[PDB]
Protein backbone atom coordinates (compact mmCIF):
# COMPACT_ATOMS: atom_id res chain seq x y z
CA UNK A 1 0.00 0.00 0.00
CA UNK A 2 2.87 2.14 1.24
CA UNK A 3 5.55 3.45 -1.90
CA UNK A 4 8.83 2.07 -0.59
CA UNK A 5 11.35 4.52 0.76
CA UNK A 6 14.88 5.00 0.06
CA UNK A 7 16.90 2.19 1.50
CA UNK A 8 19.59 4.24 3.10
CA UNK A 9 16.78 4.59 6.03
CA UNK A 10 15.99 1.32 6.43
CA UNK A 11 19.87 0.20 7.35
CA UNK B 1 11.80 27.60 19.23
CA UNK B 2 11.67 32.02 18.74
CA UNK B 3 9.34 30.96 15.31
CA UNK B 4 7.47 28.36 16.63
CA UNK B 5 3.79 28.14 15.31
CA UNK B 6 4.57 30.45 12.31
CA UNK B 7 3.82 28.19 9.00
CA UNK B 8 5.95 29.55 6.45
CA UNK B 9 3.29 29.03 3.71
CA UNK B 10 0.58 30.79 5.73
CA UNK B 11 1.25 33.56 9.32
CA UNK B 12 5.26 33.80 7.41
CA UNK B 13 3.23 35.16 4.25
CA UNK B 14 0.65 36.64 5.91
CA UNK B 15 -2.14 34.74 4.07
CA UNK B 16 -4.28 32.53 5.77
CA UNK B 17 -5.82 28.92 5.26
CA UNK B 18 -9.39 28.23 4.26
CA UNK B 19 -10.82 27.27 8.08
CA UNK B 20 -8.85 29.03 10.52
CA UNK B 21 -11.62 31.92 10.61
CA UNK B 22 -13.73 29.15 11.98
CA UNK B 23 -11.40 28.82 14.77
CA UNK B 24 -11.31 32.75 15.61
CA UNK B 25 -14.61 33.14 15.24
CA UNK B 26 -15.24 30.57 18.30
CA UNK B 27 -13.16 32.19 20.66
CA UNK B 28 -15.90 34.35 22.22
CA UNK C 1 -10.12 11.68 10.52
CA UNK C 2 -13.93 11.49 10.23
CA UNK C 3 -15.78 14.06 8.07
CA UNK C 4 -12.57 16.55 7.33
CA UNK C 5 -10.98 17.52 4.32
CA UNK C 6 -7.95 17.22 2.51
CA UNK C 7 -5.23 19.51 4.08
CA UNK C 8 -4.08 22.34 2.44
CA UNK C 9 -0.14 22.28 1.02
CA UNK C 10 1.90 23.55 4.46
CA UNK C 11 -1.16 23.77 6.48
CA UNK C 12 0.22 21.87 9.18
CA UNK C 13 3.90 21.93 9.34
CA UNK C 14 4.37 20.01 12.22
CA UNK C 15 2.43 16.96 11.99
CA UNK C 16 4.75 13.72 11.43
CA UNK C 17 3.72 10.21 10.69
CA UNK C 18 5.18 7.49 12.71
CA UNK C 19 6.19 4.93 10.52
CA UNK C 20 6.72 1.24 11.25
CA UNK C 21 9.82 -0.23 9.30
CA UNK C 22 8.43 -4.12 8.93
CA UNK C 23 6.21 -4.12 7.41
CA UNK C 24 6.10 -0.59 6.30
CA UNK C 25 2.58 1.06 7.34
CA UNK C 26 1.43 4.38 9.09
CA UNK C 27 1.53 3.46 13.01
CA UNK C 28 0.08 6.92 14.46
CA UNK C 29 0.38 10.57 14.03
CA UNK C 30 2.93 12.71 16.36
CA UNK C 31 4.31 16.38 16.17
CA UNK C 32 7.69 18.56 15.41
CA UNK C 33 8.30 20.49 18.75
CA UNK C 34 11.52 21.16 17.69
CA UNK C 35 14.85 20.20 15.28
CA UNK C 36 15.76 17.01 17.31
CA UNK C 37 12.10 16.03 19.07
CA UNK C 38 8.75 14.73 18.62
CA UNK C 39 5.59 14.34 20.69
CA UNK C 40 2.98 11.79 20.19
CA UNK C 41 0.61 9.23 22.33
CA UNK C 42 2.20 6.81 25.10
CA UNK C 43 -0.14 4.38 23.46
CA UNK C 44 1.68 4.48 19.92
CA UNK C 45 4.22 3.04 21.51
CA UNK C 46 3.46 1.02 24.71
CA UNK C 47 0.06 -0.51 24.64
CA UNK C 48 0.48 -3.91 26.63
CA UNK C 49 -2.96 -4.99 26.40
CA UNK C 50 -2.11 -5.48 22.76
CA UNK C 51 1.19 -6.95 22.91
CA UNK C 52 2.53 -3.37 21.63
CA UNK C 53 6.19 -2.35 22.74
CA UNK C 54 7.83 -0.71 20.13
CA UNK C 55 11.41 0.04 20.27
CA UNK C 56 13.37 2.74 18.80
CA UNK C 57 14.73 0.43 15.95
CA UNK C 58 11.32 -0.55 15.08
CA UNK C 59 10.44 2.70 13.82
CA UNK C 60 10.80 5.85 11.40
CA UNK C 61 9.59 9.02 11.64
CA UNK C 62 8.08 11.12 8.53
CA UNK C 63 8.25 14.66 8.17
CA UNK C 64 7.20 17.49 5.90
CA UNK C 65 3.76 14.71 4.44
CA UNK C 66 1.23 15.38 2.38
CA UNK C 67 0.24 12.72 0.89
CA UNK C 68 -0.07 9.36 3.05
CA UNK C 69 1.55 6.66 1.16
CA UNK C 70 3.85 8.32 -1.30
CA UNK C 71 7.36 8.69 -0.74
CA UNK C 72 7.56 12.47 -1.51
CA UNK C 73 11.16 13.02 -2.42
CA UNK C 74 12.51 16.68 -2.36
CA UNK C 75 9.62 17.38 0.64
CA UNK C 76 9.41 14.79 3.12
CA UNK C 77 12.52 13.90 5.30
CA UNK C 78 12.64 10.75 7.25
CA UNK C 79 14.51 10.29 10.51
CA UNK C 80 15.76 7.66 13.22
CA UNK C 81 14.90 7.79 17.04
CA UNK C 82 17.78 7.89 19.25
CA UNK C 83 15.06 7.40 22.05
CA UNK C 84 11.51 7.18 23.23
CA UNK C 85 10.69 8.64 26.36
CA UNK C 86 7.51 7.64 27.74
CA UNK C 87 5.77 9.34 30.71
CA UNK C 88 6.64 7.38 34.02
CA UNK C 89 2.84 7.79 34.88
CA UNK C 90 0.98 6.43 31.91
CA UNK C 91 -1.67 4.34 32.73
CA UNK C 92 -2.15 1.74 30.02
CA UNK C 93 -4.09 -0.58 32.58
CA UNK C 94 -6.77 1.66 33.22
CA UNK C 95 -7.73 5.03 30.96
CA UNK C 96 -5.02 6.18 29.40
CA UNK C 97 -4.37 8.67 32.03
CA UNK C 98 -1.29 10.52 31.22
CA UNK C 99 -0.96 9.20 27.06
CA UNK C 100 2.05 11.36 26.03
CA UNK C 101 5.52 10.56 25.11
CA UNK C 102 8.55 12.10 23.49
CA UNK C 103 10.85 10.97 20.65
CA UNK C 104 14.59 12.27 20.79
CA UNK C 105 15.39 12.06 17.30
CA UNK C 106 19.45 10.91 15.61
CA UNK C 107 20.21 13.72 13.72
CA UNK C 108 18.24 17.24 13.61
CA UNK C 109 15.85 17.91 10.88
CA UNK C 110 15.88 21.15 8.55
CA UNK C 111 12.91 22.86 8.61
CA UNK C 112 11.31 24.45 5.14
CA UNK C 113 8.47 25.63 4.17
CA UNK C 114 6.71 21.99 4.99
CA UNK C 115 8.18 21.45 8.35
CA UNK C 116 8.09 23.76 10.76
CA UNK C 117 6.91 23.27 14.65
CA UNK C 118 4.51 24.10 16.86
CA UNK C 119 4.14 25.40 20.08
CA UNK C 120 3.88 24.54 23.54
CA UNK C 121 0.91 26.38 24.77
CA UNK C 122 2.15 28.17 28.05
CA UNK C 123 -0.09 28.70 31.41
CA UNK C 124 -1.79 31.89 30.43
CA UNK C 125 -2.32 30.24 26.62
CA UNK C 126 -3.92 27.10 27.80
CA UNK C 127 -5.77 29.05 30.67
CA UNK C 128 -7.57 31.38 27.98
CA UNK C 129 -7.96 28.91 24.93
CA UNK C 130 -9.17 25.93 27.05
CA UNK C 131 -12.78 26.58 27.40
CA UNK C 132 -16.08 25.00 25.90
CA UNK C 133 -17.29 25.71 22.75
CA UNK C 134 -13.35 27.11 21.76
CA UNK C 135 -12.36 24.95 18.88
CA UNK C 136 -9.18 23.48 17.71
CA UNK C 137 -7.60 21.47 14.63
CA UNK C 138 -6.54 17.76 14.51
CA UNK C 139 -5.19 16.62 12.00
CA UNK C 140 -4.32 13.06 10.71
CA UNK C 141 -3.98 10.38 8.10
CA UNK C 142 -6.00 7.88 9.95
CA UNK C 143 -9.58 6.21 8.78
CA UNK C 144 -12.01 7.83 7.17
CA UNK C 145 -14.97 6.18 8.95
CA UNK C 146 -15.02 4.06 12.26
CA UNK C 147 -16.06 0.42 9.87
CA UNK C 148 -11.80 4.33 3.92
CA UNK C 149 -8.24 5.60 4.14
CA UNK C 150 -7.11 8.77 2.68
CA UNK C 151 -5.56 10.12 -0.19
CA UNK C 152 -3.68 12.88 1.93
CA UNK C 153 -3.55 14.26 5.17
CA UNK C 154 -7.03 15.18 6.53
CA UNK C 155 -8.25 18.22 8.62
CA UNK C 156 -11.52 18.76 10.65
CA UNK C 157 -11.74 21.91 13.43
CA UNK C 158 -14.07 20.67 16.79
CA UNK C 159 -15.42 22.48 19.20
CA UNK C 160 -13.68 21.97 22.95
CA UNK C 161 -16.93 19.91 25.11
CA UNK C 162 -17.93 20.40 28.62
CA UNK C 163 -16.29 18.65 31.20
CA UNK C 164 -19.38 16.97 32.80
CA UNK C 165 -20.77 16.19 28.91
CA UNK C 166 -17.12 14.91 28.50
CA UNK C 167 -17.77 12.50 31.65
CA UNK C 168 -21.31 11.34 30.53
CA UNK C 169 -20.85 9.80 27.69
CA UNK C 170 -18.89 7.63 28.83
CA UNK C 171 -18.04 4.13 31.25
CA UNK C 172 -14.48 5.24 31.45
CA UNK C 173 -12.88 7.42 34.23
CA UNK C 174 -11.68 10.93 33.00
CA UNK C 175 -8.99 12.68 34.09
CA UNK C 176 -7.49 15.85 34.70
CA UNK C 177 -5.02 14.90 32.35
CA UNK C 178 -7.57 14.83 29.37
CA UNK C 179 -10.03 16.95 27.61
CA UNK C 180 -12.57 16.38 24.61
CA UNK C 181 -14.09 17.52 21.77
CA UNK C 182 -16.87 17.14 18.90
CA UNK C 183 -19.99 18.24 17.77
CA UNK C 184 -22.95 17.44 19.92
CA UNK C 185 -25.96 15.93 18.18
CA UNK C 186 -28.16 18.52 18.17
CA UNK C 187 -25.46 20.91 16.62
CA UNK C 188 -25.77 19.06 12.82
CA UNK C 189 -21.92 19.17 12.14
CA UNK C 190 -19.53 15.84 12.65
CA UNK C 191 -16.27 15.03 13.12
CA UNK C 192 -13.43 13.01 14.65
CA UNK C 193 -10.18 11.25 14.72
CA UNK C 194 -10.27 7.93 13.98
CA UNK C 195 -7.91 4.24 13.94
CA UNK C 196 -4.20 6.02 12.53
CA UNK C 197 -4.72 9.61 13.92
CA UNK C 198 -3.87 8.94 17.54
CA UNK C 199 -0.29 10.77 18.77
CA UNK C 200 -1.47 13.84 16.48
CA UNK C 201 -2.19 16.70 17.40
CA UNK C 202 -5.01 19.64 18.43
CA UNK C 203 -3.92 23.04 17.92
CA UNK C 204 -5.48 26.31 18.43
CA UNK C 205 -4.33 29.86 16.83
CA UNK C 206 -3.76 31.69 19.99
CA UNK C 207 -5.57 35.48 18.88
CA UNK C 208 -3.36 37.16 20.86
CA UNK C 209 -0.15 36.28 19.39
CA UNK C 210 -1.00 34.65 15.89
CA UNK C 211 1.20 31.39 16.44
CA UNK C 212 -0.20 28.11 16.68
CA UNK C 213 0.01 25.45 19.80
CA UNK C 214 -1.03 22.33 20.67
CA UNK C 215 -3.22 22.08 23.33
CA UNK C 216 -3.86 18.57 23.00
CA UNK C 217 -2.58 14.52 21.73
CA UNK C 218 -5.26 12.88 20.11
CA UNK C 219 -5.53 9.70 22.84
CA UNK C 220 -8.77 7.74 22.33
CA UNK C 221 -12.25 7.39 21.43
CA UNK C 222 -14.96 4.80 21.49
CA UNK C 223 -15.59 4.26 18.02
CA UNK C 224 -15.26 7.26 16.17
CA UNK C 225 -17.68 10.18 15.21
CA UNK C 226 -20.84 8.03 17.00
CA UNK C 227 -23.00 10.23 18.18
CA UNK C 228 -23.61 11.43 21.36
CA UNK C 229 -19.59 10.47 21.66
CA UNK C 230 -16.71 12.88 21.46
CA UNK C 231 -12.56 12.44 20.77
CA UNK C 232 -10.20 12.17 23.97
CA UNK C 233 -7.06 14.00 24.01
CA UNK C 234 -3.73 14.21 26.12
CA UNK C 235 -3.76 17.73 27.94
CA UNK C 236 -0.61 18.97 27.13
CA UNK C 237 -0.62 21.71 29.35
CA UNK C 238 -0.96 19.60 32.14
CA UNK C 239 1.82 17.23 31.21
CA UNK C 240 4.27 20.12 30.29
CA UNK C 241 6.63 20.30 33.28
CA UNK C 242 7.57 16.08 32.17
CA UNK C 243 7.93 17.11 28.77
CA UNK C 244 10.38 20.08 29.73
CA UNK C 245 12.35 17.90 32.51
CA UNK C 246 12.36 15.73 29.53
CA UNK C 247 14.39 17.52 27.40
CA UNK C 248 16.28 19.88 29.68
CA UNK C 249 17.71 16.72 31.08
CA UNK C 250 18.30 14.33 27.84
CA UNK C 251 18.32 17.23 24.94
C1 LIG D 1 -9.47 4.29 27.36
C2 LIG D 1 -9.29 2.82 26.95
C3 LIG D 1 -10.63 2.10 27.15
C4 LIG D 1 -8.24 2.16 27.83
C5 LIG D 1 -8.88 2.74 25.50
C6 LIG D 1 -7.92 2.07 24.82
C7 LIG D 1 -8.12 2.45 23.49
C8 LIG D 1 -7.47 2.05 22.19
C9 LIG D 1 -6.09 1.39 22.31
N1 LIG D 1 -6.34 0.00 22.72
C10 LIG D 1 -5.04 2.22 23.07
O1 LIG D 1 -4.09 1.91 22.02
C11 LIG D 1 -5.17 1.62 21.10
N2 LIG D 1 -9.10 3.29 23.35
O2 LIG D 1 -9.61 3.49 24.66
C1 LIG E 1 8.57 -2.56 27.12
O1 LIG E 1 9.73 -3.13 26.51
C2 LIG E 1 10.95 -2.68 27.11
C3 LIG E 1 12.08 -3.21 26.24
O2 LIG E 1 12.13 -4.63 26.29
C4 LIG E 1 11.01 -3.18 28.54
O3 LIG E 1 12.22 -2.72 29.15
C5 LIG E 1 9.82 -2.64 29.31
O4 LIG E 1 9.79 -3.19 30.62
C6 LIG E 1 8.51 -2.97 28.60
N1 LIG E 1 7.39 -2.32 29.28
C7 LIG E 1 6.27 -2.96 29.61
C8 LIG E 1 5.24 -2.14 30.32
O5 LIG E 1 6.09 -4.14 29.35
NA1 LIG F 1 -19.66 8.66 32.94
NA1 LIG G 1 -19.53 12.26 18.30
Known amino acids: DFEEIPEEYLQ | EADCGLRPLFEKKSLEDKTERELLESYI | ?251
Open chain 3, 1 to 251: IVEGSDAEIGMSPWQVMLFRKSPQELLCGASLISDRWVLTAAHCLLYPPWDKNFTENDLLVRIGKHSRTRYERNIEKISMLEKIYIHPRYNWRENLDRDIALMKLKKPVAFSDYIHPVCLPDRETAASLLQAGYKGRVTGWGNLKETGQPSVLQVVNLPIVERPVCKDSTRIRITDNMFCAGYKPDEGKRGDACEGDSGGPFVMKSPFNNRWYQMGIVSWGEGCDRDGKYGFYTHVFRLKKWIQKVIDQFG
